Amino acid sequence: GRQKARGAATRARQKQRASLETMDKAVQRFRLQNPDLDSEALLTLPLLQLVQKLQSGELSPEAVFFTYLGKAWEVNKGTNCVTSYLTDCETQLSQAPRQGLLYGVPVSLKECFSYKGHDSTLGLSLNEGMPSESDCVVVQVLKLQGAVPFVHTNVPQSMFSYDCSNPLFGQTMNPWKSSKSPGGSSGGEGALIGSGGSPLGLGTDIGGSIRFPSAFCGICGLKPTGNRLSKSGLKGCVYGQTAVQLSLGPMARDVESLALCLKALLCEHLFTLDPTVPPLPFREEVYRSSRPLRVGYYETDNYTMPSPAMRRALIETKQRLEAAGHTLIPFLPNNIPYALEVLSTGGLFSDGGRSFLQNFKGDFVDPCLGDLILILRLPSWFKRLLSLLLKPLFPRLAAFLNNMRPRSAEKLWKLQHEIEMYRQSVIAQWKAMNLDVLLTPMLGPALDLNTPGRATGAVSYTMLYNCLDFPAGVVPVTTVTAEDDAQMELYKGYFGDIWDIILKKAMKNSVGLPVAVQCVALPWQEELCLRFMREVEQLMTPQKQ
Template sequence: MRVPLPALLGGSALLLLLLRWRRRRALWRKVAEAQERQERSLVRMEAAARRFREQHPSVNMVSILSLPLPELSKKLRDGSLPPDHVFYAYVGKALQIATETNCITEFLQESETQLRKAKLMEKQGLLYGVPVSIKDSIDCQGHDSTLGFIKNLNKPAAEDSVVVQVLKRQGAIPFVKTNVPQSLISYDCKNLIFGQTCNPLLYTRTPGGSSGGEGALVGGGGSILGIGTDVGGSLRFPAAFCGICAIKPTGNRLSKRGVMAGVVGQKAVAAAVGPLAKDVESLALCLRALLSEDMFSLDSTVPPLPFNEEVYSSTKPLRVGYYETDFFTMPSPAMRRAVRETKQLLEEAGHTLVPFELTNVDCVVFSYCVRGMFADGGRSFVKKFEGEMEKGGTGLLFWLAKAPHWLKTLLSWIAKPFVPRFSSIVRSMKENTVDEVWSLHHEIEDFCHQFIAQWKKLNLDVMLCPMLGPAFGIGYPAKLSVAVSYTMLYNALDFPAGVVPVTLVTDEDEEELKGYKGYYQDWWDRTLVKAFRGSVGMPVAVQCVALPWQEELCLRFMKEVETLSLKKNSFF
């Protein structure tokens, strides 16, 4: 008997709906299991911290948590502070911050075993006994690196990433993994598995991303040292938004083996692994520990450049380039004031400040960064989302990556007279030939050499730059992908860049914001002013930059900025 065509089509449609429902149900089950694991982790942390407090009621947790990393590390190594006192003080504090901000995805239970071994071993390593938090995307043996994707659940890493191996060899104790935005290509911090992470300073604000869980945990005092990654500002946004310090090294100064990337294989925009901490000296201590023989022997692609103590400890006056704006993203009043006040402090301290003229940032953002990261038209980026239930957090980029070439061309042409930035971003998302990709890489190399030539013509040591801030409200980063211009420039150039908080938003800054128009006066500029509003009391940072492989000079400059700002202000 022949089945009527309408009945056949109806049956097929019903079958497809049933299969789709079953697949989604299976995905939700995986999400629920992951959330239960997260909850169990927090319960284990609570039980461990409570057990220690009951057994050691006289231990002053507050005094331990108040110690800066260099002093804490010294006390651990000389034996005046037992490692279990430090470990459980931070487990307890991390639990509190996780409850408030949802920044921790998993407690690394083997950290307690490592702690017991540390108590028995002869003290060694610069980070002996120091609890360290690790970003989700950095492999820890036996644990998932999800990047916020459901498909990556229940796929534990076979071994530790090189950076985690080196941390352990230096005596550090990785104890938690922290939340990230789905795909990492966002400077908010939300995914369908673990949800939204909040800023510890103001819960309605984003902590930044993609190392947002790290920013929230370190910024809230639940970790004394965190390890994250940066491909467009992913260390610097969380640090600036949460009022702490971070450094993005030159891309290959620290090993990226075992570190998962948001866009795999692209070489146009350099990614980097780096630390976040409350102060610059803590960042320097971390790099001293990581830039060891262990790093170079475990990953021979990393140049064997140990930490240069002489450069970091130098007191020679610096010749500092500076600019207040990149003429692409208009700085908020607080951003501009942060640069001006820091410039004045540096001049009063005997340093020479030289104006630096920044040009063609729109070309860097669109032609180099967006086009370089999505050189295949965004196909590999879209592929990462296959089978996922949510594509949030990436906003316009995901939609454009999915759009066919003819639609991108048409949209770019129609939009050019009215919204030129939108037109440029659409045009930059087209699929490139191999020849075009090679030409692009050559253009980026030329741009880098031109930038360095301008730097050397002015005989600069370092550069003082604005850093986007204050922290946006949750959800705004997805609407403001173009606002990464201040940070992404130094990924395209592959220069080391760090952030240091220097001031807080004032009532005067908020009042000045009423006159904010932006350089393009388009939808992005109108949205940006809304994102800046209502931020009185929130921290604002500056960016400190050096030439490639000069992390120690970058840190030395950051330390100078930090010291001068602390002398002037008493809010940190």
């Protein structure tokens, strides 16, 4: 019963196509009137220098806007990362506030950041032809700070994924290798920023969806504490689920860009437009501190075996931090399996997936979601039974199935308390070793297209910090060598289940692809997190600063 959804696809693709044409026509007009502009030099300027030149008058907003608009159009050709051109953004451009900290900066938005007059489909038929009545709060703040949001970027269908394909706009590709995923669900942002088509973007993250795309596409990303920024006006699939919180945050080519973005967002405009966000301004002096850090670290979470490239990235960064004078302390959060199998899965699937499934009624199911929908559709008893059969041979799979069952409000309260007491556990663990920050591996290199949805285990590295609601960011530190990739033939994985087997195959043939580490601080500590990220960036890739 899918013809209605075929109509949605046809209409969505027409709007995407017309958006692209509108963009190109404006780019072609602009270039004719400005034939001598050094567009390469403008595009490769770091955000901090770009901002300064816009503030001084050295570069016109128009010059910067249309150049990035040109570049976004071009990189889209090989990645399919842009779903929509934000129609009024040229008239926004001419009205941008001069004193704004982001005056004249083109910014790209993940499709779920509602923008007036435009759909936030999430790749779902039922959200097509349902344009937002207004800009969401962070989009309002961006504009009040002088920025110019200019495109919506692609997401995997429903966002419940770390790949990036849906049936309306299709499949987004990694800009480093087109057989590879850009990661997700902020994958359009990853591909666009990662190929130079936007200097700053916003994404969201409930199990790693800022961090996967950033890592897979070789850019920086930060997932703040859930309630550091406003979620007001965000489009979603499931509403009212508060056990594992959603976070939104910046993506960019460097760390300084992330810190600029958070500084611009954490202002009175935000705090008055959404009073439910604690009014905590950006603390520059914590961000800029150069005091030695106590850095906890691990090479593996003992759940998802790291690739050789991940492991090399982690050890090398550790050794450089030591040489720079920081104290590196072996540290692994306790009971990760519990945090993932019981707390995180149970938090996301407390209703057995029912609320989530209503979004898919009458719709196609994108191949990049794997068997997720099929598995969620199954009866609560046949899940339970299959869980008991799989437990001897495949304990991970069994635990997954058993913890995605529907349960009562009573049981949800108990789960919510366990999440709270686990949070306090890890905090106490952290304080007993007197850590400032924590260094971890990050999933990478980029997986093959249509494999993330079959490698669910691999979310272990990022999902843990959604469960704990700790700020976490990722920084590119190296690229896959011939040796790293060859050494994947010796990868086994701790479990030997289908998730380990898919991941092994998924990560092969990745020579030249970027690989990241993850940086973590305690709740409300975004500034310390970024300081630390800045340090990693400086030591492993000094040409960024």
